[PDB]
Amino acid sequence: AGKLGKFQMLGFQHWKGLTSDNHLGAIFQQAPQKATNLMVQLLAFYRGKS
Amino acid sequence: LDTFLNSFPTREFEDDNEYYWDVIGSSRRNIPLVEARDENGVVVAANAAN
Amino acid sequence: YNTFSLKLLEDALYELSASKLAMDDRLFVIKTGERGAIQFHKEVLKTVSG
Amino acid sequence: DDPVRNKILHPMGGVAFSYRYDIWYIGTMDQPNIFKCKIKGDNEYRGYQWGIRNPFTGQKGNPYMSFDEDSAVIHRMATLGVCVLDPTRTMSLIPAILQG
Amino acid sequence: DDPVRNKILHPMGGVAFSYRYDIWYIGTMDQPNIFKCKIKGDNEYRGYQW
Amino acid sequence: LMGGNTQGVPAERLQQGERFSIEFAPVEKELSRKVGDVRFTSPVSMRNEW
Amino acid sequence: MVISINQVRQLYVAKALKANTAALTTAGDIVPKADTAKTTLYFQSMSPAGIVASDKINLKHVLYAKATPSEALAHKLVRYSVTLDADVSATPVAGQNYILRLAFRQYIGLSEEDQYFKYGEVIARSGMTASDFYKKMAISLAKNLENKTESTPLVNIYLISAAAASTDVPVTSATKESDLTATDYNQIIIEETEQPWVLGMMPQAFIPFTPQFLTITVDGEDRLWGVATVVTPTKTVPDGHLIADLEYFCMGARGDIYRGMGYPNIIKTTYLVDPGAVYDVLDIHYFYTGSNESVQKSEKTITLVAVDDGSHTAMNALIGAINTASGLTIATL
Amino acid sequence: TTIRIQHKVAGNKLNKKLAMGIPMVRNLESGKQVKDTANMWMHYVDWEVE
Ligand SMILES: [Mg+2]
């Protein structure tokens, strides 16, 4: 119901019924994944090492 | 249309979670100028001597 | 574009190729329709006419 | 130049989508820049909302009848995705008639 | 053509340093007219002040 | 001003629109103190959906 | 924006000037304090949480102290003025297409090597008055620039008529020649636009460009038709989005440095900069030196930011206080 | 001609590790950024110096 720590940001959350992605995202259970093979080098003709 | 699309490859994922890839760019830089002052801190106008 | 011009095209493709492509890499394949191939022919013709 | 989907016509002859030029690969990226995204193990699902008879599968008697009416239904779903990493490696100049 | 170092841009496109016509090695000299000067052992001195 | 310049630098060349670059740090061969330093950068990322 | 620190900086916001350490009630409230000996100076700042005090400034180890009027910090937006070269032809020649190239040097990346080209073109006609040419070309430039296929606002297009000569007529992708009714247009103006700013992820940056022209055959020779004349800027981006990011940074020197790298397990930091407000800046440099063998200096910076009305009032009182309290002589800006 | 370079660092950077919340990147001679797996800050300052 209250804060124990001095810099504690999270509180205890609770809900009853049908659970949604919004629920799971609001309690930090949803995260975008990182595509590691996917990558983008900005195309340019580098006039360096010339 | 099937041929247009079948001309492209396809890549698998694990879920319908938003994905993100990294984008690395360029390094070499070149700094602009704001103004210039003489030895006495007075700024040099374009109608001025060396 | 309202009126297709090859002048604008050669400018854009060159400027692009300069900043981003090697002289051995500036081949541009265009996918279009038969009516576009004719528009292209018409303009290349108007060009050499000059 | 498919006249079915492309319904706007150019006055100088034909379908205004033929008057359309596209360089899809400005260079070689060494990595596919355009690909069809798919999900693993969670692709198309299929089910039947039927009563006593199913023409689809050919079933005559139903132990678990969805409804009383003598009818069968079929539902399918699919998830799609398509990525273009950098549209800066794609050049396309288009007729204005196809704009707004 | 390096756009970083070459800052002045030509009315006709690109850096004004690309419009620079230079003939190196006029004629033929028995020895090189241009070379890089180094010193025998090692003029590379590294040190830490910590 | 290095390079032996004696007449100075016109007012132009010292205006809002002017861009610079780093060449080198020249030092004495007698009683040389310290000069120079290095520089860093960082990339970005991109996203998609279903 | 990450910046260069000689070895450290610190920023305190002068939202209000208080005469005493007791009158510190609201955040931002600041007071400069120094002994009568004028041997040490420090600022007491009303922090949101509580009350803090800057490092102590030995008034004999001060190197430079100077203010700034927030006008030297507003990045001016360079605007060209495009015209028809009166030496080629004061009017458009009928059968020639006047293409205009806009070269962008830092498009997405940091380098000049990362450059990008938009265009604008009009095929002239008989009896096409120069005003009509600037019109049709302005629409062509705006439509290709401000369309729904641009990830950033590259450029802004304006027109000018001989009557006004100072009022810039806007031209976007939503404008039509039916709206541009004047007949005395003299030029096409082309500015650069301020890009999106996020507090500590995307810094203030611009895309600088150059209007490059293509040739037209007038009699028998290829000739450029335009004159990309640079004129005095009239629009600037204020200091707000710049001070806030400086503040965002200089509050890791005396606070939380992670600032989000554990999202729910973060120490939230409150900031006192309002982007949209304009701040003058006072900057003091100084050092600390040891006793006998520790003569190596330790140079230190202390930055102060006060909002700027037209009259530089907040920072001229702050300076007057610091001068009477430390005996220094900082120039009232 | 003689040339000199310097660069200051704090001891805390010793055996220091980086929390790769965004990829850590080196700057190349060409001018292109290159992603790096390294987590040590000394790895990168060493590169920028040479
Ligand atoms: Mg594209």
From Swiss-Prot, chain A:
Subcellular location as annotated: Virion
Function field: Capsid protein self-assembles to form an icosahedral capsid, with a T=9 symmetry, about 77 nm in diameter. Each asymmetric capsid nonamer is covered by 9 capsid auxiliary protein, 1 copy of the trimeric head fiber protein and 2 copies of the dimeric head fiber protein.
Description of how the protein assembles with itself and partners: Interacts with the auxiliary capsid protein (via FD region). Interacts with the head fiber dimeric protein. Interacts with the head fiber trimeric protein. Interacts with the portal vertex auxiliary protein.
Remarks, miscellaneous: Displays an HK-97-like fold with an insertion domain that protrudes at the capsid surface.
The protein's name: Major capsid protein
From Swiss-Prot, chain B:
Highest classification ranks of the organism: Viruses, Duplodnaviria, Heunggongvirae, Uroviricota, Caudoviricetes
Subunit structure, as described in the record: Interacts with the auxiliary capsid protein (via FD region). Interacts with the head fiber dimeric protein. Interacts with the head fiber trimeric protein. Interacts with the portal vertex auxiliary protein.
Compartments where located: Virion
Protein function: Capsid protein self-assembles to form an icosahedral capsid, with a T=9 symmetry, about 77 nm in diameter. Each asymmetric capsid nonamer is covered by 9 capsid auxiliary protein, 1 copy of the trimeric head fiber protein and 2 copies of the dimeric head fiber protein.
Name of protein: Major capsid protein
Transmembrane segments: none
Superkingdom: Viruses
Miscellaneous remark of the record: Displays an HK-97-like fold with an insertion domain that protrudes at the capsid surface.
UniProtKB/Swiss-Prot annotation, chain G:
Subcellular locations according to the entry: Virion
GO cellular component annotations of the record: viral capsid, decoration
UniProt KW GTP-binding keyword: no
Principal place of residence: virion
Annotated stretches, region: FD: 75-237
Keyword Ligase: no
Function, in words: Auxiliary capsid protein that forms an outer layer on the major capsid protein protrusions.
Domain notes: The central region FD is structurally similar to Helicobacter pylori flagellar cap protein FliD.
Subunit-level organization: Interacts (via FD region) with the major capsid protein.
This protein's name: Auxiliary capsid protein
